[PDB]
């Protein structure tokens, strides 16, 4: 696209060859990594990459010199498919100049492009080139750099990597203060341990202060003052990609309920002629002289994604007593649901590897509570149905069905296709889509009946879905956003949930076994400052302090966030940090992270 | 910088030609003959920047 | 014409939808609606008509079909007039005996549910006492019979529980289900005369907003409405004085129809009511 042409046109990906040589720091050897040396029939030796045959750069090495490199015994022409972990680790410590290494993360695998990325980044801030990485949120950027920091520090308890989560409301003064304190602790770490400090700006593309970050690394200056060259300090910046939504979701978004408060041509938040409302990542334009310095990682090509979601699920099932085999059932049903999200021209916001651990958190909530929920479901289905829905339910597979019921099935509009595409992975009690639909229908009926009774109510599928989702995401402190028409029974759900979700003064027994909720409302307006939003968060956190947080949850309910959409006061810009750690301009704590409707 | 979209010629007219910057609840700034102000602006505006003594830089 | 003569029969619309769910999304033509969909409805309806004209119907169809007519007895008399307008003859001796039969059947099953809830409140209050007259009713409650005839020996037994209602079983189950509060009031409060100082002692520890204040009045009206039962009972009472005090209980019910919801909304505030007496200095001054 003409407005995304300097950015979206990646002239190359990671999947194009990376022929590297390095001369080792403490050792006196060479590393030939990323390419192979083969013999030509003209008496010359050429560079050929693995995984295909490409004979790029004929006439590079003479064959008697190649024989000489046999004589002085360089580690030449080695593929890193058949090396064990200790040998790859000692090739890393010889190449990265690290003395006496350990293996800091045995779960983190070392394939050959992870070596090339680690050695590439280390070369870039060994010579002086700035390090800017343009990759998506799902790909392994923070894991690779934390492995690099833990490998470069070896064993010392000091603080080497500092990760700054840049959001849209990140002002320049915070970034300047954080670079100065990172510079102070960089001097302190070099003075005590002879060790250098990495400052990792994550998502360094969402703010208007990205040019400020250009001041930090492209010409090495902090608000007019220079950075000391012999201090020991490296700034790595990560950026979100630029792509426009495919047109059908922009159709379903302009028509979701009442439409946007502003139009698409008289809106103020642009990049070129494109609104930021219509982009997948809310990115501002990179300044030039960082465009020829940014380069791309991989994109998680869907083969190794199963491995990463398996490590995440085995680290968050806590399978000391769950199951041996149903963890694999969780893993491949989540892989199938992620592939269903990929087998469509869009996702919501490309939520890969963060929706999965949130959804495993939901599964853990259900499986911890799958003792009274199944008794109440047995009671309800016996008093209100036949013996068809009166079978014994597995307390692990039912929780998985409801996990994908609230993670993926609730937001989608093509729900029946999702159910018939996800039922090919489940075992015997959920082989059909009808069984999953019946199960979520009966448990939504169970939570609507656990509420106090109402007559002349619009008892429909929308009210049941909204009550069910709101009860769960208030229990788990997941934010939920609800757009509908002005008669969608979406504020009636707020009333009946806020009256039913009392802790010990509840009506039924299911809600008596859950948390107490006191909510502070704030009706947004086009004339809304962000200070009111910060005051509402601090007020509900003031309600939440001093109490048992397993039986008390505060939740902010913002009532007209559609009216605060493109207001020039920009009140929702502060919303993105306040939903993550619960407070801006303060260190996180308990009684600060609050629920959000 | 490049992300300073909608403020440039008013500021250049105040500081470089009208020689002032004023706060109505406070102090007033006067440009003085005796200091040099270089204003690094990358590249409508292309004609307004021509009014000034200009040092252009090329690849 | 026959559907125009039979649209105000709710039973006909029930039969229509329960036999037209027996066909499954089919684009079908009008002349075969009359044969594939109308003629089985008319044949089943005419067999049912000649059944009610004779009286060979069983009790299973009586409580399976006529379930939505309980304490709604004008529509069923009007419905039998519309039902007999199909076949044009007299309607003199057919309606009133079976409407009376359905009224005795409905009050019989209402009396069964009343007997189950009165034995449940007899158990949960701790009063052993003696009734000895609802034993064959319970031996009938797990019995099952299949005939359509008019049960006489129970009529005099049902003269003690004629006019209770379709409500008031709600009141009895709110007594019988809220057991922790009635145990706590026999343990901790023990009499009517401390209520006038207990309301004043609770009105400090309550809040300032309107729900917080009206919890006190809800508790007061709840225990003033049930004080005839939870404080004045001996542990061994017979049935006659039990209904004699329930009589003035019905006088106590006539000034306030909302008393079991007040009992329930007071019964889910037991933790506050436990906090009332043992309250220290609650250091929140007030607004």
Tokens read off for B46: 């292309």
Q: How many CB pairs under 8 A join A and B?
A: 14
3-state helix, strand, coil in chain B (%, to 5): 30, 15, 60
C-alpha to C-alpha distance for A311 and A303, rounded to whole angstroms? 14
- Nearest residue in chain A measured CA to CA from C264: A507
Enumerate the β-bridge partners of residue A45.
A39, A61
Contact of A493 with A467, CB cutoff 8 Å: yes
Tell me A414's DSSP state: -
Q: Which helix (H) or strand (E) holds A46?
A: strand A44-48
Query: Is A288 close to B42, i.e. CB distance below 8 A?
Result: yes
- Look at C271 and A506 and tell me if their CB atoms are within 8 Å: no
> Which of the other chains make 3 or more beta carbon contacts under 8 angstroms with chain B?
A
Helices (H), A24-137: 63-71, 85-95, 112-127
Please give the distance of CA A172 from its chain centroid, rounded to a whole number: 24
CB contact set of C238 (below 8 Å; sequence gap of 6+): C129, C130, C131
Structure tokens, A258:
């009442």
Taking the CA of residue B38 and the nearest CA in chain A, the distance in Å comes to: 14
- Count, in order, helices (H) and strands (E) of chain B: 2, 2
Q: Hunting for tokens 């797990």 — which residue is that?
A: C142
- Read off φ and ψ for residue C6, nearest 5 degrees: -130, 35
Tally of CB atoms within 10 A around A495: 11
C-beta separation of A395 from A371 below 8 A: yes
Assess contact for A442 and A385: CB atoms under 8 A: yes
- Considering only CA atoms, which of C104, C101, C106 is closest in space to residue C57? C101
- Which tokens go with A172? 């320049």
A134 CB-near residues (< 8 Å, 6+ apart):
A10, A238, A239, A240, A241, A294, A295, A296, A297
**Collapsed DSSP state (helix, strand, coil) of residue A33:** strand
**Residue A399 parent element (H or E):** helix A397-407
Q: Which residues of C218-246 are buried (b: 16+ CB within 10 A; e: fewer)?
A: bbbbbbebbebbbeeeeeebebeebeeeb
Helix (H, G, I), strand (E, B) or coil at A464: helix
Radius of gyration of chain B (CA): 13
Alpha-carbon gap, residue A406 to A472, rounded angstroms: 9
Chain centroid, CA A199 distance in Å: 19
Instruction: Report the C-alpha gap between A435 and A498 in whole angstroms.
Output: 30
Please list the residues that pair with A36 across neighbouring strands. Answer: A48
At least 3 CB pairs under 8 A between chains A and B: yes
Whether the CB-CB separation of A125 and A148 falls below 8 Å is answered with no
Cβ-proximal residues to A250 (8 Å cutoff; 6+ apart), any chain: A278
Q: Is B43 on the interface with A (CB under 8 A)?
A: no
Within an 8 Å CB–CB cutoff, is residue A221 touching chain B? no
Query: What is the distance between the terminal CA atoms of chain B, rounded to a whole angstrom?
Result: 19
Interface-testing mutation among A504, A509, A512, A551, with chain C (most C C-beta atoms within 10 A): A504
Are residues A542 and A580 in contact, defined by beta-carbon separation less than 8 angstroms?
A: no
Residue A507: which of C268, C271, C272 has the nearest Cβ? C268
Rg for chain A, CA atoms, rounded = 28
Contact (CB, 8 A) for A329 and A397:
yes
Q: How far is CA C207 from CA A113, A324, C204, C285, in A?
A: 65, 53, 8, 10
Distance between CA A175 and CA A168 in Å, rounded? 12
Whole-number Å distance between alpha carbons of A414 and A248:
13
Q: Considering only CB atoms, which chain C residues are within 8 Å of A506?
A: 268
Backbone φ and ψ of C156, nearest 5°: -60, -35
Assign 3-class secondary structure to A353-395.
Answer: CCHHHHHHHHHHHHHHCCCHHHHHHHHHHHHHCCCCCCCCCCC
- Asked if the Cβ–Cβ distance from B2 to A285 is below 8 Å, we say yes
Look at residues A455, A444, A458 and name the one whose alpha carbon lies nearest to residue A487.
Answer: A458
Rounded Cα distance between A8 and A6, Å, is: 6
Give all strands (DSSP E) within chain B, no chain letters.
Answer: 20-22, 28-30
Interface test with B, best of A211, A219, A223 (most B CBs within 10 A): A211
* C-alpha–C-alpha distance, residues A279 and A409, integer Å: 24
Query: How far is A466 from A491, CA to CA, in rounded Å?
Result: 9
Contacting partners of chain A (3+ CB pairs under 8 A): B, C
Nearest CA to C79 out of C166, C15, C138 is that of C15
Residues of C in contact with A504 (CB under 8 A): 271
Pick out the residues of the known binding site of B. Answer: 40
- Distance in Å, alpha carbon of A530 to nearest chain B alpha carbon: 23
Tokens of A410: 């609730």
Residue A571: which of A533, A541, A537 has the closest Cα?
A533
Smallest CA-to-CA distance from A409 within A388, A430, A394 is with A430
Q: Is C269 touching A (CB cutoff 8 A)?
A: yes
Q: How many helices (H) and strands (E) does chain A have?
A: 19, 15
SS (H, E, C) chain B: CCCCCCCHHHHHHHHHHCCEEECCCCCEEECCECECCCCCCCCCHHHHHHHCCCCCCCC
A27: left (phi over 0), alpha (psi -120 to 50) or beta: beta
Place of tokens 């047109």: A247
Q: Compute CA C27 distance to the chain's CA centroid, rounded to the nearest angstrom.
A: 44
**Structure tokens belonging to residue A195:** 């060790």
CB within 8 Å of A90: residues ≥ 6 apart: A101
- In chain C, residues preceding a discontinuity (C to N beyond 2.5 A) are 24, 150
Closest CA to A372 of A499, A257, A464, A508: A508
Please state the residue numbers annotated as binding site of A for ATP: 214, 289
Q: Measured between alpha carbons, how far is C273 from C267 in angstroms, rounded to an integer? A: 9
Contacts of A510 (CB under 8 A, 6+ apart): A372, A373, A376, A446, A447, A450
The residue among C129, C115, C134, C133 whose CA lies nearest residue C237 is C129
From chain B, the residues in CB contact with A214 under 8 A are 1
Give the three-state DSSP class for A406: helix
> A504-532 burial, b if ≥16 CB within 10 A, otherwise e?
ebbbbebbeebbbbebbebebeeebebee
Alpha-carbon span B5 to A245, nearest angstrom: 25
Token pair belonging to A160: 């080497």
**Beta-carbon separation of A210 and B3 below 8 A:** yes
Contact A584, A593 (CB under 8 A): no
CA dist A22 and A14 (Å) reads 19
* Cα–Cα dist A319/C13, whole Å: 56
- A287 vs chain B: nearest CA distance in angstroms? 6
Structure tokens at A87: 């040998």
Sign of CA dihedral A82, A84, A87, A88: positive
Rounded to 10 degrees, the C-alpha dihedral C228/C234/C238/C244 comes to -20
In 3D, which of C185, C190, C176, C182 has the Cα closest to residue C122? Answer: C176
- CB within 8 Å: C271 and A505: yes
Residue C269: closest CA among chain A residues belongs to which residue?
A505
Per DSSP bridges, beta strands B20-22 and B28-30 are antiparallel
Using a CB-CB cut-off of 8 Å, the residues of chain A touching C264 are: 507
Long-range contact pairs involving B48-51 (C-beta distance under 8 Å, separation at least 24): B48/B8, B48/B9, B48/B12
Place of tokens 């940014």: A294
Shortest CA gap B2–chain A (Å) = 6
C-alpha–C-alpha distance, residues A273 and A283, integer Å: 14
Q: Name the nearest CA neighbour of C263 among C193, C189, C122, C168.
A: C168
Q: Is B1 on the interface with A (CB under 8 A)?
A: yes
Contact at CB, A208 and B42, closer than 8 angstroms:
no
Cα A385 to its chain centre, rounded Å, is 42
Q: What is the dihedral of CA C254, C257, C260, C261, to 10 degrees?
A: -160
- Using alpha carbons, list the distances in angstroms from residue A181 to A186, A233, A299, B52: 8, 11, 33, 40
C178, C212, C268, C271: which to substitute to probe chain A, counting the most A Cβ within 10 Å? C268
Cβ count near C281 (within 10 Å): 5
What's A179's DSSP letter? H
Beta carbons within 10 angstroms of residue A466's beta carbon: 26
CA distance A185 to C127: 77
Kindly give the pairing relationship between strand A294-295 and strand A595-596: unpaired
Residue A544 in contact with residue A554, Cβ under 8 Å?
Answer: yes
Rounded distance between C-alpha atoms, residue A500 and residue A471, angstroms: 9
Residue whose structure tokens are 């068809």: A388
Cα dihedral A522, A527, A528, A530, rounded to 10, equals 180
According to DSSP, residue A287 is labeled: P
What is the spatial distance between Cα C172 and Cα C150, in angstroms, rounded to a whole number? 29
Which residues fall within 8 angstroms of residue A499, CB to CB, at 6 or more apart?
A: A451, A452
Length of chain B measured in residues: 59
The technique by which this structure was obtained is: cryo-EM
Residue C9, exposed/middle/buried by CB under 10 A (0-12, 13-18, 19+)? Answer: buried
Residue A504 near chain C (CB below 8 Å):
yes
Question: Count of alpha carbons within 13 Å of A134, Cβ hemisphere only?
Answer: 22
Q: Does B7 touch chain A (CB under 8 A)?
A: no
Here the tokens at position C90 are: 């007299």
Q: Is C168 left (phi over 0), alpha (psi -120 to 50) or beta?
A: left
Nearest-angstrom CA–CA distance, A85 and A106? 9
Considering Cα of A504, then A509, then A510, then A511, what sign does the dihedral take? negative
Contact A516, A551 (CB under 8 A): yes
Burial category of A55 from C-beta neighbours within 10 Å (exposed 0-12, middle 13-18, buried 19 and up): exposed
> In the A/C pair of chains, how many CB contacts fall below 8 A?
8
Closest to C95 in 3D by CA, of C127, C42, C53: C53
Q: Are A319 and A241 in contact (CB under 8 A)?
A: no
User: In this complex, does chain B touch chain C, defined as having at least 3 beta-carbon pairs under 8 Å apart?
Assistant: no
The CA–CA distances, whole Å, from A404 to A412, A423, A466, B51, C28 equal 11, 11, 16, 64, 39
CB A125 within 8 A of CB A234: yes
User: Residue A212 belongs to what H/E stretch?
Assistant: helix A210-217
Q: Which positions ≥6 away from A478 have C-beta within 8 Å?
A: A358, A362, A472, A595
Kind plus residue range of the DSSP H or E element containing A131: strand A131-134
Resolution in angstroms comes to 3.5
Helix residue ranges, H only, C168-282: 169-177, 180-188, 195-205, 210-230, 239-254, 259-267, 270-277
A211 touches chain B (CB under 8 A): yes
3-state class of A555 per DSSP? strand
Determine whether the interchain pair C271/A507 forms a contact, defined as Cβ–Cβ distance below 8 Å: no
Distance CA B5, CA A579 (A): 30
- Using CA atoms of A527, A531, A532, A533 in order, give the dihedral in degrees to the nearest 10: 100
Nearest to C112 by CA among C66, C59, C158: C158
**C-alpha to C-alpha distance for A402 and A442, rounded to whole angstroms:** 11
Query: Cβ of C268 under 8 Å from any chain A Cβ?
Result: yes
Cβ(C102)–Cβ(C150) under 8 Å?
A: no
Those residues whose C-beta lies under 8 Å from the C-beta of residue C114, and which sit 6 or more positions away, are C161, C164, C169, C172
Of C278, C267, C264, C270, the closest CA to residue C205 belongs to C278
Q: What angle do CA A87, A89, A93 make, to 5 degrees?
A: 115
Residue A304 tokens, joined: 């190794």
Token readout for A17 is 């060859």
Question: Checking DSSP bridges between strand A44-48 and strand A294-295, what pairing results, if any?
Answer: unpaired
Other C-beta atoms within 10 Å of C77: how many? 11
Cα gap C1→A453, rounded to integer Å:
43
B24: Cβ–Cβ under 8 A, 6 or more apart, which residues?
A: none
Which distant-in-sequence residues (6+ apart) come within 8 Å of A88 by Cβ? A80, A110, A115
What kind and span of H or E run contains C157?
A: helix C155-158
Distance CA A234, CA A124 (A): 10
Q: Are C76 and C102 in contact (CB under 8 A)?
A: yes
CA A597/CA A521 separation, integer angstroms = 10
Cβ distance A211 to B1 less than 8 Å, yes or no, reads yes
A549 to A355, A372, C60, C165: CA distances (angstroms):
24, 21, 54, 46
The sign of the dihedral angle between the CA atoms of A350, A354, A357, A360 is: negative
Closest CA to C207 of A536, A518, A546: A518
Can you tell me the distance from the alpha carbon of A34 to that of A113, in angstroms, rounded to the nearest whole number?
A: 8
Interface chains of chain C (3 or more CB pairs under 8 Å): A
- Note the Cα A488 to chain centre separation in Å: 31
């Amino acid at each position: 696209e003409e407005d995304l042409a300097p950015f979206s046109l990646r002239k190359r990906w990671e999947s194009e060859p990376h022929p590297y040589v390095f001369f080792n720091g403490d050792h006196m050897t060479m590393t030939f990594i990323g390419f192979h040396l083969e013999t030509n029939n003209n008496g010359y030796v050429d560079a050929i990459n693995p995984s295909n045959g490409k004979v790029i750069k004929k006439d590079v090495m003479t064959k008697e010199l190649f024989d000489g490199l046999r004589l002085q015994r360089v580690p030449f022409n080695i593929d890193f498919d058949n090396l064990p972990r200790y040998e790859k680790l000692e090739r890393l410590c010889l190449a990265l100049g690290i003395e006496w290494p350990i293996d800091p993360d045995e779960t983190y695998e070392l394939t050959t492009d992870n070596m090339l990325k680690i050695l590439a980044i280390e070369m870039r801030f060994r010579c002086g080139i700035p390090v800017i990485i343009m990759g998506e949120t799902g790909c392994g950027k923070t894991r690779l750099i934390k492995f690099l920091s833990d490998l470069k520090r070896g064993s010392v308890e000091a603080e080497t990597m500092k990760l700054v989560k840049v959001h849209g409301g990140t002002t320049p003064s915070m970034i300047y203060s954080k670079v100065k304190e990172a510079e102070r602790t960089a001097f302190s770490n070099k003075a005590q341990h002879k060790l250098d400090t990495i400052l990792f700006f994550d998502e360094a593309n969402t703010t208007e202060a990205v040019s400020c970050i250009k001041e930090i690394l492209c010409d090495r200056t902090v608000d007019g003052e220079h950075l000391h060259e012999d201090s020991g300090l490296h700034i790595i910046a990560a950026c979100n990609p630029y792509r426009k939504h495919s047109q059908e979701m922009i159709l379903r978004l302009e028509s979701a309920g009442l439409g946007y408060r502003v139009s698409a041509e008289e809106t103020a938040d642009r990049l070129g002629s494109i609104p930021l409302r219509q982009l997948v990542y809310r990115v501002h334009a990179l300044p030039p002289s960082l465009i020829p310095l940014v380069w791309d990682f991989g994109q998680l090509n869907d083969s190794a994604e199963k491995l990463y979601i398996q490590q995440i699920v085995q680290r968050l099932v806590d399978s000391v007593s769950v199951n041996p085999s149903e963890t694999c059932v969780i893993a491949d049903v989540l892989s199938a649901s992620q592939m269903f999200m990929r087998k469509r021209e869009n996702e919501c916001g490309f939520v890969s590897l963060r929706d999965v651990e949130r959804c495993v958190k939901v599964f853990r909530w259900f499986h911890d509570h799958s003792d009274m929920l199944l008794k109440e479901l047995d009671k309800f289905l016996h008093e209100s149905s036949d013996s068809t829905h009166t079978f014994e339910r597995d307390p692990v597979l039912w929780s998985l069905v409801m996990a994908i019921g609230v993670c993926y099935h609730a937001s989608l509009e093509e729900k029946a296709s999702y159910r018939t595409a996800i039922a090919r992975c489940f075992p015997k009690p959920y082989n059909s889509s009808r069984a999953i639909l019946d199960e979520v229908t009966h448990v939504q009926d169970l939570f609507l009946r656990g509420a106090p009774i109402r007559t002349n109510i619009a008892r429909n599928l929308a009210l049941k879905e909204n009550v069910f989702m709101m009860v769960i995401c208030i229990e788990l402190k997941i934010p939920l956003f609800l757009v509908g028409k002005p008669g969608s029974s979406k504020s009636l759900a707020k009333i009946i949930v806020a009256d039913a979700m009392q802790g010990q003064a509840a009506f039924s027994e299911l809600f008596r076994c859950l948390k107490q909720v006191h909510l502070v409302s704030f009706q947004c307006s086009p004339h809304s400052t962000p200070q009111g939003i910060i005051s509402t968060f601090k007020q509900c956190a003031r309600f939440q302090q001093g109490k048992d947080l397993g039986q008390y949850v505060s939740v902010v309910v913002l009532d007209e966030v559609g009216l605060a959409e493109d207001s020039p006061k920009m009140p929702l810009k502060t919303l993105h940090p306040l939903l993550e750690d619960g407070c801006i301009e303060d260190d996180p704590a308990p009684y600060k992270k609050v629920g959000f409707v | 910088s490049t992300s300073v979209q909608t403020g440039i010629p008013i500021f250049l007219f105040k500081l470089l030609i009208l020689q002032y910057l004023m706060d109505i609840n406070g102090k007033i700034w006067r440009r003085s003959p005796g200091h040099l102000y270089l204003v690094e602006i990358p590249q409508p505006l292309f004609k307004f920047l021509d009014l000034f003594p200009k040092v252009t830089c090329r690849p | 014409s026959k559907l125009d003569s039979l649209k105000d029969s709710h039973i006909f619309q029930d039969f229509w939808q329960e036999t037209a769910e027996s066909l499954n999304e089919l684009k079908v033509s009008l002349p075969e609606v009359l044969e594939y969909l109308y003629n089985p409805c008319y044949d089943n309806f005419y067999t049912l008509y000649e059944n009610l004209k004779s009286g060979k119907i069983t009790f299973a169809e009586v409580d399976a079909i006529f379930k939505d007519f309980v304490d709604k007895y004008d529509e069923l008399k009007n419905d039998l007039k519309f039902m007999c307008t199909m076949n044009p003859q007299d309607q003199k001796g057919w309606i009133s005996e079976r409407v009376g039969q359905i009224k005795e059947y409905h009050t019989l099953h209402q009396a069964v549910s009343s007997a189950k809830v009165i034995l449940q409140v007899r158990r949960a209050l701790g009063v052993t006492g003696d009734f000895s007259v609802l034993n064959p009713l319970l031996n009938f409650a797990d019995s099952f019979e299949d005939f359509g005839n008019e049960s006489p020996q129970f009529i005099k037994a049902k003269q003690l529980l004629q006019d209770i209602s379709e409500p008031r079983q709600r009141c009895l189950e709110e007594l019988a289900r809220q057991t922790e509060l009635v145990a706590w009031l026999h343990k901790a409060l023990e009499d009517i005369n401390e209520l006038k100082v207990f309301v004043d002692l609770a009105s400090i520890s309550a809040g300032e907003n309107d729900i917080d204040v009206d919890r006190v009045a809800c508790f007061h009206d709840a225990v003033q409405g049930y004080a005839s039962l939870l404080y004045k009972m001996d542990e061994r009472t017979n049935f006659s004085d039990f209904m004699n005090h329930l009589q003035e209980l019905w006088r106590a019910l006539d000034n306030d129809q909302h008393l079991p919801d007040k009992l329930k909304d007071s019964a889910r505030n037991l933790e506050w009511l436990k906090t009332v007496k043992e309250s220290h200095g609650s250091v929140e001054l007030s607004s």
